Amino acid sequence: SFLLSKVSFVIKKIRLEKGMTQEDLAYKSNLDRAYISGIERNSRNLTIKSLELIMKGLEVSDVVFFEMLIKEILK
Amino acid sequence: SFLLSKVSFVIKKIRLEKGMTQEDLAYKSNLDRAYISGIERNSRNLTIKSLELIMKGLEVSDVVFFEMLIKEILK
């Protein structure tokens, strides 16, 4: 999946910009660390709900996530 | 969920814009009509891969789907 790879890139990029570890994001979002880790490797076929939870744990607005996704796809 | 109802709304809006029924879309995408139906009710369980595949069947680029999603969130 091209789209799944761009999605995973942005999640990890925003996470690192916010200064959170995968373990911090796990506890925030109530997702397991291993699911987080797989998402960032492009190895979990993430649902929309899971994406919502991650954006919430990352404290990024949904518009900001989608804007950076569009930018990354356009590169 | 606000995000989930906006995602479902946009998939349905575009499918209607392209003049497809739920079944037209399913036949095009090798999915079932009941899956398309459930997605438009409740986008909880939609994955990134399924989303890519739906956009492909709708012949809407990824960048355009995310624009219409942002418009809807902001409206």
Residue numbers in the entry:
A (entry chain A), B (entry chain B): 3 to 77
Direct quotes from the study:
The C-protein binds at various sites within the C/R promoter to regulate transcription of its own gene and the associated endonuclease gene. Flexibility in this loop is very important for DNA sequence recognition, as it has been observed in the nucleoprotein structures to adopt different conformations depending on which operator site the protein is bound to.
The mutant protein R46A bound with a much lower affinity (∼16 nM), and T36A did not show any measurable binding under these conditions. An even more important role is indicated for T36, since the DNA binding ability of the T36A mutant was completely abolished, as measured by SPR. The ΔΔG for R46A is significantly larger (8.5 kJ mol−1), and that for the T36A mutation must be larger still, since we could not measure any DNA binding activity of this mutant protein. Both R46 and T36 of C.Esp1396I are seen in crystal structures of DNA-protein complexes to interact directly with the base pairs involved in sequence recognition, specifically with the G and C bases, respectively, of the C-box recognition sequence GTC. T36 is not part of the flexible loop region; it is in fact near the N-terminal end of helix 3 and therefore the likelihood of a mutation at this position altering the loop conformation is minimal. The T36A mutant protein crystal structure showed both the major conformation (I) and the novel conformation observed in this study (III), indicating that both could exist simultaneously in different subunits of the protein dimer. Despite Y37F and T36A only crystallising in the presence of SO4, this anion was not visible in either electron density map.
